[PDB]
Amino acid sequence: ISPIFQGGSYQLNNKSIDISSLLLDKLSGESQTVVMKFKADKPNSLQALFGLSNSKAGFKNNYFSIFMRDSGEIGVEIRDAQKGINYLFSRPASLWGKHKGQAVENTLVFVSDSKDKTYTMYVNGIEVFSETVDTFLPISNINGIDKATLGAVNREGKEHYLAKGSIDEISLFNKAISDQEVSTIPLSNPFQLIFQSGDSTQANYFRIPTLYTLSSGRVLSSIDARYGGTHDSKSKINIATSYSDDNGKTWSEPIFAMKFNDYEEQLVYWPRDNKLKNSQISGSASFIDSSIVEDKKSGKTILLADVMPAGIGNNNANKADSGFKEINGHYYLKLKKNGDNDFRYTVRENGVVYNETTNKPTNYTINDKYEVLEGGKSLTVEQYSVDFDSGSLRERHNGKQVPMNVFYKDSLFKVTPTNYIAMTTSQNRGESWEQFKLLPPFLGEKHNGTYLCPGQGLALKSSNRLIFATYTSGELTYLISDDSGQTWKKSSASIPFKNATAEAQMVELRDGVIRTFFRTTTGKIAYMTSRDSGETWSKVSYIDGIQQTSYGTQVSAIKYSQLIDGKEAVILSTPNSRSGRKGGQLVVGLVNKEDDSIDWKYHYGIDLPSYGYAYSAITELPNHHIGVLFEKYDSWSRNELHLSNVVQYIDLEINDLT
């Protein structure tokens, strides 16, 4: 259909523009649709983009507005005093501010639909809220409406919520357009999506991105596919991966690298209200935090992740048990049988379930996939689904059968309730992935498995050595394999923090010289150096000129292949802020060949300082551009839980950074 209004290039400099003569009479019916292309790269703290109101005295609570905050949040208000209606829908982290030194054209689409009694907002091709009321309030049915306003709301004659920015195009429709039509409205997005709600993973939520450029030029990406909101385990999470063969222009329909089936892969809309937002999927097994590297010698691609048995995450993780019993050089996975109160079984060679108390094998066995066999026949369990139908999270059986897995709740033999690490491998550069295998323990029986640092492993340019940074309390623990990931040894490096979350990423400054940048609890990003290919590690230092928060945030880094100002260069991706996870930056450091020290010359703000920015992934593309797959929200704030499509991808050229 056609618009009943269409104006444009409205500049908003803390002064409201009246357009009521150009709209109010054309308002008709109980269903409207607003489409607005706008820019705000310097917004006020809270500001109205568009507004209908009742400006007459005694009716300051009678208005529709479309507002944004400088945290990037967007929302509508719908208020009518005489009806006793005060609606307030919004979603944080819904906007872009700047990109490549320029204002982003945001494309806002708000549909008000009285047939379905639903309010729905889109920004930049993404749906950020869709709410249904029992008592619908048409935005043109607000009693006594007399003003249509751009960049403020006119209440009792005054401008409230004055906006700074601009509205290049705005148009209204006397209909509720279908979801189908919304997708037809062209976008001017500065970003694109790899993983998204509705894709093959069926996860409404995504966290913990990774980027890697293969020898072929293929770019690989792995992700936490999180089903029960954006929570860390305990939850249900799978590891999903997807690649790109055109420098990051197009991406493949994601497959799973790691997956459990104890729970149904459901696209749920996790609740965002204060009472229910702490709901966790508590009975499921999961994976958190993946990391990728490529082995030059074999050709294999190698993915590691943390593994959680049913119920378990970091909070209740059996700190001080590895899950394995050591019997002369060997590490056998411990198991508990239903009814027992201690772990009286182990898994020996060929998956045979061996009894300890008797030293006799049993009629039970474990296959490739950590499933359970009895006499060679496959035991099963019944899958769980989740729903909120009774106004409270319920986790019940759904009638479907899956193979019994030792990481599952209902399983006959359960593994130790602690955290492990698994590796999987791809012989075809990420088109499929082998069944995962558990990595051994490295710090003794009576110590829990360490925590894989998410992002990139390191493949040393002038050898076959592969390294994956992991962390535990008190140290960084590098895992090192010189045989294509078949065997591993550890290399500890003491860090001056008890119980830190020391997420580490490495760079190779020149042959055998690895610098690791890691997250601390001091507000400052730390680092250490190796000069024997990771064998031994230096003492800790700290980057000045980048600020983090007291808890801090994952940092990702690459060595750039090219020279910048004649010196060898290194790029950091991190939030740059000491309040929260916002103010994303790519920071360029030039290496000094005298002491291998780094001069942090260049700061590039990915978006506005006040706009959200969390865990990130960088990679040097085949054509020397930079890919950045990142969480565009405050992944720490309890106000920005459960947000769809905030993990986003962008393409930059060096010149943008310098």
XYZ file of C-alpha atoms in Angstrom:
658
model
C 0.000 0.000 0.000
C 0.882 3.713 -0.015
C 2.042 6.142 2.693
C -0.399 8.852 3.827
C 2.535 10.995 4.909
C 6.139 11.343 3.723
C 8.597 14.067 4.636
C 12.338 14.027 5.106
C 15.662 15.682 5.912
C 14.345 16.993 9.255
C 17.276 18.193 11.397
C 16.728 17.938 15.161
C 18.761 20.416 17.214
C 17.046 20.448 20.629
C 13.960 22.018 19.047
C 10.710 20.247 18.229
C 9.299 20.325 14.701
C 5.511 20.501 14.411
C 3.885 18.451 11.638
C 0.372 18.125 13.029
C -1.040 20.134 10.116
C 0.551 17.602 7.785
C -0.636 14.400 9.495
C -3.349 14.551 12.178
C -6.339 14.683 9.818
C -4.995 11.833 7.676
C -4.833 9.575 10.745
C -7.518 6.932 10.294
C -8.414 3.505 11.599
C -7.041 1.697 14.620
C -3.925 0.316 12.901
C -0.912 2.390 11.971
C 2.661 1.830 10.829
C 5.637 4.114 11.269
C 8.721 3.839 9.066
C 11.546 6.148 9.869
C 15.121 6.405 8.666
C 17.101 8.333 11.274
C 20.513 9.285 12.614
C 21.689 10.004 16.143
C 25.434 10.059 16.771
C 25.308 12.546 19.611
C 21.933 11.816 21.247
C 20.680 13.339 24.473
C 20.371 10.989 27.418
C 16.720 10.245 26.677
C 15.018 11.534 23.549
C 11.822 11.307 21.513
C 12.115 10.703 17.788
C 8.432 11.001 16.979
C 5.309 11.811 18.944
C 1.550 12.095 18.959
C 0.193 13.900 22.032
C -2.502 15.759 23.859
C -0.865 19.108 24.522
C -3.807 20.690 26.325
C -3.573 21.395 30.087
C -4.569 18.472 32.278
C -3.516 15.762 29.855
C 0.253 15.397 30.106
C -0.181 11.621 30.290
C -1.862 11.309 26.916
C 0.668 10.556 24.207
C 2.316 8.095 21.906
C 6.033 8.579 21.511
C 8.970 6.789 19.962
C 11.998 7.276 22.194
C 15.618 6.244 22.377
C 18.270 6.486 25.111
C 22.008 7.123 24.645
C 22.675 3.531 25.673
C 21.221 2.633 22.268
C 17.864 1.473 23.653
C 14.684 2.115 21.658
C 11.066 2.259 22.780
C 7.498 3.445 22.455
C 5.262 4.904 25.111
C 1.496 4.583 24.736
C -0.413 6.502 27.401
C -4.080 7.508 27.874
C -5.166 8.922 31.259
C -8.900 8.556 30.634
C -8.562 4.856 29.730
C -6.110 4.053 32.523
C -3.542 2.865 29.999
C 0.211 3.279 30.343
C 2.089 1.007 27.987
C 5.883 1.073 27.860
C 7.582 -1.336 25.460
C 11.300 -1.171 24.733
C 14.484 -3.107 24.029
C 18.022 -2.072 25.033
C 20.935 -2.216 22.539
C 18.695 -1.783 19.512
C 20.560 0.927 17.614
C 23.789 1.814 15.775
C 25.435 5.215 16.156
C 28.557 5.589 14.008
C 30.426 3.452 11.479
C 33.701 4.321 9.691
C 33.592 7.838 11.165
C 30.075 8.479 9.845
C 26.494 8.391 11.128
C 24.634 5.156 10.561
C 21.243 5.438 8.920
C 18.996 3.544 11.315
C 15.835 2.122 9.785
C 13.031 1.979 12.360
C 9.728 0.271 11.626
C 6.936 0.285 14.180
C 3.689 -1.572 13.538
C 0.566 -0.969 15.613
C -1.951 -3.717 14.882
C -5.491 -3.852 16.307
C -6.634 -7.050 14.626
C -3.984 -8.984 16.531
C -3.857 -6.416 19.344
C -0.071 -6.287 19.050
C 2.722 -3.736 19.133
C 5.884 -4.608 17.251
C 9.155 -2.750 16.764
C 11.942 -3.334 14.248
C 15.256 -1.595 13.965
C 17.692 -2.229 11.100
C 15.990 -5.462 9.916
C 15.848 -6.933 13.446
C 12.672 -7.357 15.541
C 13.369 -5.954 19.030
C 9.976 -6.357 20.643
C 6.540 -7.729 19.878
C 3.942 -7.392 22.633
C 0.252 -8.364 22.853
C -2.161 -6.673 25.265
C -5.669 -7.648 26.274
C -6.802 -4.024 25.991
C -5.538 -2.450 22.775
C -4.892 1.303 22.613
C -4.749 2.615 19.039
C -2.124 5.363 18.834
C -4.555 7.698 17.075
C -7.347 6.818 19.482
C -5.583 8.512 22.391
C -8.191 10.940 23.670
C -7.778 14.634 22.892
C -4.766 14.242 20.608
C -3.860 17.599 19.028
C -0.130 17.423 18.175
C 2.215 15.427 15.953
C 5.849 16.079 16.747
C 9.304 15.148 15.495
C 12.140 15.167 17.998
C 10.040 15.844 21.107
C 6.709 15.238 22.766
C 4.422 18.234 23.267
C 2.850 17.950 26.734
C 1.041 20.952 28.311
C 2.718 23.178 25.754
C 6.325 22.221 26.518
C 8.958 20.088 24.815
C 9.836 16.963 26.787
C 12.450 14.484 25.562
C 14.131 16.875 23.081
C 16.162 14.982 20.508
C 19.538 15.682 18.970
C 20.129 14.000 15.608
C 18.188 13.898 12.343
C 15.325 12.168 10.530
C 16.130 11.696 6.820
C 12.875 9.899 6.012
C 9.629 9.315 7.902
C 6.332 7.911 6.589
C 3.048 6.688 8.079
C 0.554 4.096 6.932
C -3.053 3.541 8.052
C -2.409 -0.212 8.072
C -0.520 -2.864 10.017
C 1.865 -4.301 7.456
C 2.643 -8.027 7.739
C 6.075 -9.342 8.728
C 6.547 -10.256 5.059
C 6.363 -6.635 3.962
C 8.756 -5.357 6.648
C 11.550 -7.427 5.115
C 10.968 -5.656 1.757
C 11.888 -2.218 3.108
C 15.515 -1.693 2.019
C 18.105 -1.271 4.762
C 21.297 0.769 5.135
C 22.799 -1.465 7.807
C 26.550 -1.100 8.387
C 26.656 -4.728 9.569
C 25.425 -8.213 8.727
C 24.471 -11.407 10.560
C 26.038 -14.850 10.484
C 23.961 -16.490 13.187
C 20.410 -15.256 13.803
C 17.159 -16.205 15.481
C 15.333 -18.645 13.225
C 18.354 -20.176 11.484
C 19.169 -23.897 11.502
C 20.461 -23.833 15.111
C 17.051 -22.815 16.475
C 18.603 -20.724 19.227
C 17.005 -17.374 19.929
C 20.206 -16.226 21.513
C 23.932 -16.247 20.625
C 27.119 -15.478 22.562
C 30.903 -15.948 22.459
C 31.873 -15.444 18.796
C 35.132 -16.640 17.228
C 36.750 -15.828 13.915
C 39.446 -17.683 12.003
C 40.984 -17.354 8.534
C 42.042 -20.687 6.991
C 44.907 -21.387 4.547
C 42.287 -21.666 1.778
C 40.883 -18.197 2.453
C 37.764 -19.635 4.024
C 36.739 -17.733 7.143
C 35.413 -19.890 9.921
C 33.216 -18.766 12.787
C 32.089 -20.642 15.884
C 29.479 -19.513 18.408
C 27.622 -20.359 21.594
C 24.169 -21.350 20.433
C 22.264 -20.575 23.651
C 18.648 -21.649 23.984
C 17.581 -20.591 27.469
C 18.248 -16.863 27.255
C 21.792 -15.485 27.269
C 22.780 -17.198 30.571
C 26.067 -19.065 31.098
C 25.700 -22.737 32.057
C 23.799 -24.072 33.819
C 21.659 -23.869 30.647
C 21.202 -25.544 27.296
C 23.886 -24.477 24.799
C 25.365 -25.985 21.638
C 28.427 -24.989 19.673
C 27.531 -23.856 16.199
C 29.862 -22.911 13.397
C 29.526 -21.302 10.006
C 31.962 -20.273 7.257
C 32.346 -17.731 4.457
C 34.094 -18.176 1.071
C 33.782 -14.604 -0.199
C 35.784 -12.564 2.303
C 32.846 -12.384 4.693
C 30.245 -11.234 2.140
C 28.031 -14.298 2.560
C 27.879 -16.980 5.272
C 26.785 -20.582 5.367
C 23.734 -22.080 7.084
C 25.306 -22.969 10.475
C 25.850 -26.583 11.490
C 26.670 -27.967 14.906
C 30.281 -28.575 16.018
C 29.091 -29.882 19.388
C 25.556 -30.869 20.469
C 23.574 -32.692 23.133
C 19.995 -33.885 22.637
C 18.899 -34.369 26.217
C 16.822 -31.227 25.697
C 14.807 -30.088 22.679
C 16.425 -27.373 20.561
C 13.613 -24.834 21.036
C 13.427 -21.272 19.754
C 12.125 -19.749 23.004
C 11.409 -16.105 23.815
C 13.056 -15.826 27.224
C 11.191 -13.452 29.541
C 12.808 -10.045 30.239
C 10.762 -8.956 33.277
C 12.423 -8.646 36.701
C 10.505 -11.481 38.316
C 11.266 -14.185 35.706
C 14.463 -13.184 33.887
C 16.641 -15.298 36.216
C 15.007 -18.494 34.979
C 17.723 -21.010 34.036
C 17.460 -24.274 32.197
C 18.775 -26.431 34.996
C 18.444 -30.029 33.881
C 20.314 -29.809 30.607
C 23.831 -30.567 29.485
C 25.717 -27.998 27.448
C 28.876 -26.580 25.896
C 30.229 -23.063 26.613
C 33.072 -21.067 25.084
C 34.522 -22.519 21.868
C 37.919 -21.850 20.266
C 39.364 -22.556 16.825
C 42.734 -23.149 15.189
C 43.982 -24.754 11.963
C 46.752 -27.370 11.762
C 48.989 -26.690 8.745
C 50.537 -30.146 8.749
C 47.472 -32.417 8.730
C 45.044 -29.909 7.214
C 42.511 -30.555 10.017
C 40.556 -27.757 11.615
C 40.386 -28.051 15.389
C 37.698 -26.847 17.769
C 37.750 -26.991 21.569
C 34.982 -26.185 24.080
C 34.048 -26.457 27.741
C 31.643 -29.342 28.486
C 28.933 -29.359 31.183
C 27.073 -32.460 32.409
C 23.373 -32.073 33.139
C 22.761 -29.412 35.771
C 26.251 -27.958 35.937
C 27.970 -24.644 35.135
C 30.722 -22.595 36.838
C 28.545 -21.820 39.923
C 28.272 -25.410 41.193
C 31.187 -26.886 39.220
C 32.998 -29.438 41.351
C 36.086 -27.331 41.913
C 38.684 -29.944 43.040
C 37.760 -33.031 40.991
C 38.836 -33.724 37.413
C 36.318 -36.439 36.730
C 39.071 -38.949 36.031
C 40.734 -41.666 38.106
C 44.481 -42.047 37.449
C 45.817 -45.612 37.239
C 49.485 -45.706 36.222
C 49.985 -43.071 33.524
C 46.403 -43.524 32.318
C 43.360 -41.375 33.054
C 40.038 -43.206 33.087
C 36.719 -41.339 33.130
C 34.845 -41.965 36.381
C 31.124 -42.839 36.406
C 28.379 -43.284 39.049
C 25.568 -45.854 38.748
C 22.004 -44.906 39.718
C 21.450 -45.568 43.425
C 25.128 -45.402 44.402
C 26.277 -42.448 46.522
C 29.875 -42.542 45.334
C 31.606 -43.098 41.988
C 32.210 -46.808 41.783
C 32.838 -47.280 38.063
C 35.309 -46.185 35.355
C 35.529 -46.260 31.573
C 38.452 -48.349 30.381
C 39.728 -49.053 26.869
C 37.046 -49.709 24.245
C 34.468 -47.931 26.378
C 34.001 -50.927 28.646
C 32.389 -50.081 31.953
C 34.622 -51.502 34.625
C 33.766 -51.913 38.308
C 36.302 -50.611 40.847
C 34.928 -52.099 44.047
C 35.241 -55.579 42.496
C 37.697 -55.002 39.637
C 35.271 -56.759 37.255
C 34.043 -55.545 33.851
C 30.261 -55.089 33.404
C 27.750 -55.528 30.611
C 27.810 -51.785 29.974
C 29.790 -49.809 27.388
C 30.357 -46.286 26.053
C 30.642 -45.466 22.344
C 32.092 -42.549 20.375
C 29.348 -40.133 21.454
C 29.567 -40.839 25.206
C 26.322 -42.797 24.994
C 25.541 -45.911 27.029
C 25.246 -49.468 25.646
C 24.100 -52.613 27.470
C 25.240 -55.862 25.885
C 25.894 -53.838 22.761
C 22.325 -52.518 22.611
C 21.568 -48.781 22.919
C 19.859 -47.613 26.092
C 17.796 -44.451 25.793
C 16.238 -41.631 27.773
C 13.224 -39.387 27.174
C 13.959 -35.828 25.987
C 12.927 -32.702 27.870
C 11.120 -29.644 26.552
C 10.632 -26.292 28.294
C 7.678 -23.879 28.370
C 6.395 -20.954 30.438
C 2.679 -21.705 30.007
C 2.006 -21.841 33.780
C 3.662 -18.439 34.266
C 6.816 -20.131 35.561
C 9.572 -22.151 33.854
C 8.729 -25.839 33.547
C 11.084 -28.561 32.354
C 9.195 -31.738 31.452
C 9.488 -34.856 29.317
C 8.161 -34.444 25.751
C 7.564 -38.007 24.530
C 10.646 -38.324 22.283
C 13.489 -40.857 22.641
C 17.188 -40.024 22.423
C 20.331 -42.089 23.134
C 21.281 -42.170 26.813
C 24.386 -40.017 27.280
C 26.683 -39.989 30.298
C 26.388 -36.209 30.441
C 22.600 -36.443 30.755
C 20.291 -36.162 33.752
C 18.131 -39.260 33.325
C 21.198 -41.367 32.479
C 22.001 -44.662 34.225
C 25.668 -43.781 34.530
C 26.436 -40.104 35.196
C 29.843 -38.466 34.823
C 31.397 -36.381 37.577
C 29.500 -33.105 38.118
C 32.403 -30.850 37.106
C 33.644 -29.042 34.004
C 35.685 -30.677 31.204
C 37.233 -29.716 27.860
C 36.470 -31.473 24.559
C 38.034 -31.263 21.136
C 36.394 -31.906 17.781
C 38.021 -31.917 14.357
C 36.900 -31.122 10.816
C 38.487 -32.825 7.842
C 36.578 -30.615 5.397
C 37.153 -27.111 6.786
C 33.947 -26.932 8.781
C 31.408 -28.647 6.502
C 31.077 -31.391 9.111
C 32.678 -32.187 12.492
C 33.751 -35.452 14.155
C 32.220 -36.653 17.391
C 33.971 -34.884 20.254
C 36.498 -36.532 22.503
C 37.326 -35.489 26.060
C 40.743 -33.984 26.745
C 42.719 -35.463 29.645
C 43.203 -33.613 32.946
C 46.437 -31.586 33.352
C 46.499 -30.482 36.991
C 45.943 -33.717 38.918
C 42.956 -35.829 39.934
C 41.879 -33.529 42.755
C 41.736 -30.404 40.536
C 38.853 -29.499 38.203
C 39.358 -29.179 34.440
C 40.516 -25.727 33.361
C 38.581 -23.088 31.472
C 39.137 -22.756 27.714
C 39.821 -19.175 26.667
C 37.392 -18.437 23.844
C 38.406 -17.353 20.372
C 41.570 -18.363 18.575
C 44.114 -21.052 19.255
C 47.579 -20.343 17.908
C 49.340 -22.153 15.098
C 53.010 -21.280 15.171
C 54.046 -20.099 11.726
C 57.406 -21.812 11.631
C 56.495 -25.183 13.139
C 53.579 -27.551 13.762
C 53.076 -26.520 17.358
C 49.465 -25.750 18.237
C 48.540 -23.828 21.402
C 45.168 -23.204 23.089
C 45.105 -20.769 26.007
C 43.063 -22.019 28.961
C 42.731 -20.631 32.528
C 42.143 -21.763 36.089
C 42.612 -20.101 39.454
C 46.063 -18.583 39.849
C 47.481 -19.372 36.413
C 47.164 -19.386 32.664
C 47.414 -22.980 31.437
C 48.503 -23.267 27.822
C 47.692 -26.572 26.119
C 50.362 -27.576 23.602
C 50.243 -30.301 20.964
C 53.044 -31.013 18.548
C 51.237 -33.984 16.950
C 48.159 -32.383 15.336
C 46.062 -32.533 18.507
C 46.467 -36.223 19.308
C 48.347 -35.646 22.577
C 48.655 -32.605 24.798
C 50.944 -31.305 27.518
C 50.408 -28.299 29.728
C 52.550 -25.204 30.298
C 51.594 -23.187 33.361
C 52.341 -19.497 33.762
C 51.567 -17.948 37.109
C 49.278 -14.912 37.227
C 48.932 -12.566 40.239
C 45.161 -13.122 40.650
C 43.221 -15.637 42.703
C 39.923 -16.662 41.044
C 40.306 -14.310 38.081
C 38.467 -14.795 34.818
C 41.688 -14.698 32.808
C 40.417 -14.965 29.246
C 43.511 -15.082 27.064
C 44.303 -14.626 23.393
C 47.755 -14.979 21.841
C 49.761 -13.395 19.045
C 53.054 -14.489 17.462
C 55.205 -11.346 17.303
C 58.004 -13.092 15.392
C 59.058 -16.761 15.284
C 58.874 -18.490 18.692
C 57.875 -15.221 20.367
C 54.235 -15.311 21.558
C 52.539 -12.460 23.373
C 49.350 -13.249 25.267
C 46.872 -10.487 26.097
C 44.490 -11.415 28.875
C 41.600 -10.024 30.928
C 42.094 -9.222 34.611
C 40.340 -7.829 37.683
C 42.282 -4.563 37.871
C 40.688 -2.479 35.146
C 43.859 -2.944 33.079
C 44.512 -5.455 30.285
C 47.519 -7.637 31.111
C 50.063 -9.574 29.075
C 52.984 -12.033 29.208
C 55.607 -13.189 26.658
C 57.181 -16.446 25.535
C 60.367 -16.780 23.466
C 60.594 -20.561 23.332
C 57.319 -21.162 21.467
C 55.209 -21.118 24.655
C 57.418 -23.469 26.659
C 57.985 -20.925 29.458
C 56.410 -17.606 30.296
C 57.450 -14.174 31.436
C 56.096 -12.175 34.331
C 52.990 -10.067 33.911
C 52.718 -6.475 32.648
C 49.824 -4.167 31.789
C 48.702 -2.051 28.856
C 48.254 1.613 29.711
C 45.775 3.612 27.646
C 42.963 1.078 27.529
C 40.532 0.934 30.417
C 38.380 -2.042 31.395
C 35.969 -2.681 34.241
C 36.772 -4.201 37.620
C 35.465 -7.552 36.348
C 36.753 -6.889 32.820
C 35.967 -8.422 29.451
C 37.489 -10.810 26.916
C 40.041 -9.242 24.590
C 40.833 -10.624 21.157
C 43.943 -9.975 19.098
C 45.707 -10.589 15.850
C 49.078 -9.856 14.366
C 48.489 -7.938 11.135
C 50.246 -9.317 8.046
C 51.190 -5.862 6.748
C 53.342 -2.976 7.892
C 51.755 0.088 9.420
C 54.049 3.103 9.449
C 56.965 0.814 8.571
C 56.703 -1.126 11.837
C 55.202 -4.578 12.361
C 51.699 -4.293 13.819
C 49.195 -5.874 16.191
C 45.454 -5.281 16.560
C 43.434 -5.477 19.776
C 39.671 -5.721 20.040
C 38.157 -4.782 23.386
C 35.647 -2.560 25.111
C 37.341 0.675 26.185
C 35.440 1.818 29.269
C 35.538 1.487 33.043
C 31.775 1.573 33.709
C 30.443 -1.251 31.613
C 30.901 -3.302 28.489
C 30.496 -0.469 25.953
C 32.704 1.828 23.852
C 34.098 -0.837 21.539
C 37.540 -0.274 20.066
C 40.020 -1.764 17.649
C 43.408 -0.586 18.883
C 46.521 -0.692 16.736
C 49.968 -1.287 18.205
C 53.263 -0.969 16.341
C 56.002 -3.357 17.502
C 59.416 -1.931 18.426
C 62.210 -4.302 17.346
C 64.521 -3.164 20.192
C 62.539 -4.636 23.103
C 59.428 -6.065 21.369
C 57.469 -3.382 23.209
C 54.241 -2.074 21.703
C 53.253 1.519 21.071
C 49.452 1.744 21.090
C 49.202 4.478 18.456
C 45.704 4.089 17.047
C 42.277 3.981 18.665
C 39.259 3.291 16.464
C 35.810 3.438 18.052
C 33.687 0.687 16.505
C 30.588 2.629 17.553
C 29.692 5.368 20.075
C 31.414 5.228 23.539
C 28.019 4.741 25.181
C 26.938 1.914 22.842
C 27.420 -1.672 23.965
C 30.409 -3.879 23.180
C 31.446 -7.197 24.724
C 33.306 -10.376 23.803
C 34.687 -10.056 20.263
C 36.415 -11.918 17.452
C 38.869 -10.431 14.961
C 40.478 -11.895 11.907
C 42.558 -10.688 9.009
C 40.612 -11.480 5.852
C 42.314 -12.811 2.653
C 42.086 -9.371 1.019
C 43.682 -7.748 4.089
C 40.409 -6.310 5.468
C 39.445 -6.915 9.094
C 36.459 -8.941 10.216
C 34.898 -8.231 13.607
C 32.207 -10.552 14.956
C 31.086 -9.152 18.307
C 28.463 -8.852 21.008
C 26.854 -5.445 20.479
C 25.443 -5.073 23.985
C 26.431 -4.923 27.625
C 26.778 -8.674 28.226
C 27.399 -7.859 31.892
C 24.391 -5.625 32.635
C 21.425 -7.449 34.165
C 19.244 -5.002 32.209
C 20.307 -6.328 28.800
C 19.644 -10.044 29.302
C 18.067 -12.114 26.508
C 18.483 -9.997 23.391
C 18.216 -11.517 19.909
C 20.649 -10.687 17.061
C 23.061 -8.535 18.982
C 25.996 -10.628 17.841
C 26.912 -8.821 14.649
C 29.619 -8.741 11.964
C 31.449 -5.872 10.242
C 34.131 -5.401 7.588
C 36.821 -2.746 7.979
C 39.840 -1.475 6.032
C 43.060 -0.413 7.848
C 42.701 3.227 6.786
C 39.514 3.351 8.849
C 41.579 2.488 11.927
C 44.444 4.912 11.165
